Coordinates of C-alpha atoms and ligand atoms in Angstrom, one line a residue:
X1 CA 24.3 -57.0 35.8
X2 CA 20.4 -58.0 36.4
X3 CA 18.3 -55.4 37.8
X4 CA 17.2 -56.5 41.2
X5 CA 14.4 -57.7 42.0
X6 CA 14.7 -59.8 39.3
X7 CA 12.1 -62.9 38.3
X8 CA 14.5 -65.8 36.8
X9 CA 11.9 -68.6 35.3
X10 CA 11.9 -72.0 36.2
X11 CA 10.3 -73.6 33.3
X12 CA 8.0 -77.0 33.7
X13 CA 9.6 -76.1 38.1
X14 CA 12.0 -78.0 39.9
X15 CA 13.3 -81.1 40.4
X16 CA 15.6 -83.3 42.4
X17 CA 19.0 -82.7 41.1
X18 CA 18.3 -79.4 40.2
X19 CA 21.2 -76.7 41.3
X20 CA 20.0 -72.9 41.3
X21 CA 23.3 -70.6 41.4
X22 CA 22.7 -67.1 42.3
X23 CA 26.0 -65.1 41.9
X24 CA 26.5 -61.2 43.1
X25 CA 27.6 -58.6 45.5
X26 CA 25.9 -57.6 49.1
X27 CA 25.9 -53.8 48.7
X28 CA 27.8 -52.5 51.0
X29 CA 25.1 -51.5 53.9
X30 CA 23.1 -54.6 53.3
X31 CA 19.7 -55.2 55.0
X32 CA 18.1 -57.8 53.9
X33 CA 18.5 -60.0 50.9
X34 CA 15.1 -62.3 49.6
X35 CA 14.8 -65.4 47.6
X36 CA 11.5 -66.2 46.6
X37 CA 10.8 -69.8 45.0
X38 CA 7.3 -69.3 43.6
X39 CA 4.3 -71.4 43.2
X40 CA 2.3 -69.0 41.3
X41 CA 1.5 -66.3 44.2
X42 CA 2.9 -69.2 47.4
X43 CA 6.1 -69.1 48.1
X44 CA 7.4 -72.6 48.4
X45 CA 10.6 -71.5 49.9
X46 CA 11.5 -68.0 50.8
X47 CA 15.3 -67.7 51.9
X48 CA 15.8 -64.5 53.4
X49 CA 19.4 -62.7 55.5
X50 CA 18.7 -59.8 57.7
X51 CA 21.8 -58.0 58.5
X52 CA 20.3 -55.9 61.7
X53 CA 17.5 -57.8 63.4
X54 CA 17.3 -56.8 66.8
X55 CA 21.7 -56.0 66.1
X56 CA 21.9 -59.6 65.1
X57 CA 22.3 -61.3 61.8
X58 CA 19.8 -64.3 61.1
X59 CA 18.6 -66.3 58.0
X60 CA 15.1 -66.8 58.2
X61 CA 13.6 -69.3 55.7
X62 CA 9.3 -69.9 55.5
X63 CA 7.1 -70.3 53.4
X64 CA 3.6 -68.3 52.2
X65 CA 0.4 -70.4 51.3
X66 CA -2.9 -68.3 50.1
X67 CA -0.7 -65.2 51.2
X68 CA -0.1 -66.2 55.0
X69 CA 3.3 -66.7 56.1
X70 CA 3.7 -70.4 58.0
X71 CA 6.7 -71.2 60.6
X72 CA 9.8 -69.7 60.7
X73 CA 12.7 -71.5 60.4
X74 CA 15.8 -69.3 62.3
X75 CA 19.8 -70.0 61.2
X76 CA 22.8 -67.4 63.4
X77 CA 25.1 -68.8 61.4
X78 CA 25.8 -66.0 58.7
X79 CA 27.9 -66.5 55.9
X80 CA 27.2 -62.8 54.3
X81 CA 29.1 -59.7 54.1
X82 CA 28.5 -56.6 53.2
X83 CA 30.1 -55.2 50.5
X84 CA 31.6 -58.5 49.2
X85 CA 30.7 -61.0 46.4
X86 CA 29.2 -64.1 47.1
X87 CA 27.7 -67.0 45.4
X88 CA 24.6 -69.2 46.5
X89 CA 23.5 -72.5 45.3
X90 CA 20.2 -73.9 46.0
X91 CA 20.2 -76.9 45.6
X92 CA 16.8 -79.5 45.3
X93 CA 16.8 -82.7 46.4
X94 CA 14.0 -84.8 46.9
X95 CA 12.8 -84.1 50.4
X96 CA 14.6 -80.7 51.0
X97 CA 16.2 -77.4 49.6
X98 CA 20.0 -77.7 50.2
X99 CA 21.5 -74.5 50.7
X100 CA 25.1 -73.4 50.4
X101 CA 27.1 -70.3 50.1
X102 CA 30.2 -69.4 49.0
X103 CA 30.9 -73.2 48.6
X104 CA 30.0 -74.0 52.3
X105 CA 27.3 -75.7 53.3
X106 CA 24.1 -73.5 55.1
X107 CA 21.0 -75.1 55.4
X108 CA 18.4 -77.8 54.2
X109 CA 14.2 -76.7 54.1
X110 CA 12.3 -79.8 53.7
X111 CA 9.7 -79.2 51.3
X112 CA 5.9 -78.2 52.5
X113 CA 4.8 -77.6 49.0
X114 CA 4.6 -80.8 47.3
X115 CA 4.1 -80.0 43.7
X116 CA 8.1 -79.4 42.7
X117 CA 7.2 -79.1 39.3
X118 CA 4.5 -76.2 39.6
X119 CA 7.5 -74.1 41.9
X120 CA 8.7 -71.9 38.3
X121 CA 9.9 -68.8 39.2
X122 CA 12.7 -67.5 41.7
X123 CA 12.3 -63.9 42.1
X124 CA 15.7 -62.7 43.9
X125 CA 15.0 -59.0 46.0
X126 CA 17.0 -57.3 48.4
X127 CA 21.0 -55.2 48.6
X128 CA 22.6 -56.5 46.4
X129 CA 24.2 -56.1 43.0
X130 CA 23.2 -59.3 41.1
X131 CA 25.3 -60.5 38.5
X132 CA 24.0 -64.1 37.3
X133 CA 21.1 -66.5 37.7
X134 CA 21.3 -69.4 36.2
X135 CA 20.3 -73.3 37.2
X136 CA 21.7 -77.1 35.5
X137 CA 21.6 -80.5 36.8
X138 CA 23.9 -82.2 38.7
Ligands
LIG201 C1 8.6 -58.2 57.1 O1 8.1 -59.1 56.2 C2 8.7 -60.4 56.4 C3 8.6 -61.2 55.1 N1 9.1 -60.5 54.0 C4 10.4 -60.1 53.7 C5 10.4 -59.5 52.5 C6 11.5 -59.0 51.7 C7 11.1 -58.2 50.6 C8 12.2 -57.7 49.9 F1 11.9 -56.9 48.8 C9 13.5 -58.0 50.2 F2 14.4 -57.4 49.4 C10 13.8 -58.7 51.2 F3 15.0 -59.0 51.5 C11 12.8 -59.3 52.0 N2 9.1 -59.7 52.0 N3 8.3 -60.2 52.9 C12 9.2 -62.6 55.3 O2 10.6 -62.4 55.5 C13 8.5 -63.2 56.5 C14 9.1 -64.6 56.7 O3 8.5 -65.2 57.8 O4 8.7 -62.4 57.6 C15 8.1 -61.1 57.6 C16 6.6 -61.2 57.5 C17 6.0 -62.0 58.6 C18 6.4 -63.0 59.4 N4 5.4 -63.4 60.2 C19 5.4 -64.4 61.2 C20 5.7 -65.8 60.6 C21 6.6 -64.2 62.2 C22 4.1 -64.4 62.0 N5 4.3 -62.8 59.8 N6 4.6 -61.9 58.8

């Protein structure tokens, strides 16, 4: 296990073809689960489940520039659940984040910071019980 939150490097960032597998276990009362791809202090691309807002489960993705939060972007459909295993893959492609859990498809972010190869740290945050972190190319 990796103790959570836990900072996986990105070295020299990311690039298109680039698949980020996070691999783990929502603890069993989940409330919220963070990814954090970093440009130095922004966030290029948080990812982020809430399992009770306002007694509804949402993925809400954004970004943070100079420590300001930009536009939500709101997903109900929620492929979490508590107390079991899951995998997600991030994929990057050149004009979005591709996301997909548990081998289903989720989501795509299109990109608002530019500079893929400056985004070089993931820091994962939240309930769960991480097991792996790990990235290759496709
Ligand atoms: C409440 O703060 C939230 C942010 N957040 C979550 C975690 C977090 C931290 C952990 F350690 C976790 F384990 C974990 F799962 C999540 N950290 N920051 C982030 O989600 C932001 C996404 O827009 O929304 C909240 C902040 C926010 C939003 N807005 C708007 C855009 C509506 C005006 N202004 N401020």
């Amino acid at each position: 296990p990796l103790i959570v939150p836990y900072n996986l490097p990105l070295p020299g960032g990311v690039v298109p073809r680039m698949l980020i597998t996070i691999l783990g276990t929502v603890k069993p009362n989940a409330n919220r689960i963070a990814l954090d791809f970093q440009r130095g202090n922004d966030v290029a691309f948080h990812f982020n489940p809430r399992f009770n807002e306002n007694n509804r489960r949402v993925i809400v993705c954004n970004t943070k520039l100079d420590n300001n939060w930009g536009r939500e972007e709101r997903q109900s459909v929620f492929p979490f659940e508590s107390g079991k295993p899951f995998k997600i893959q991030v994929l990057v492609e050149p004009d979005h984040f591709k996301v997909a859990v548990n081998d289903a498809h989720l989501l795509q972010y299109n990109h608002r910071v530019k500079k893929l190869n400056e985004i070089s740290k993931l820091g994962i945050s939240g309930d769960i019980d991480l097991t792996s972190a790990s990235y290759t190319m496709i």
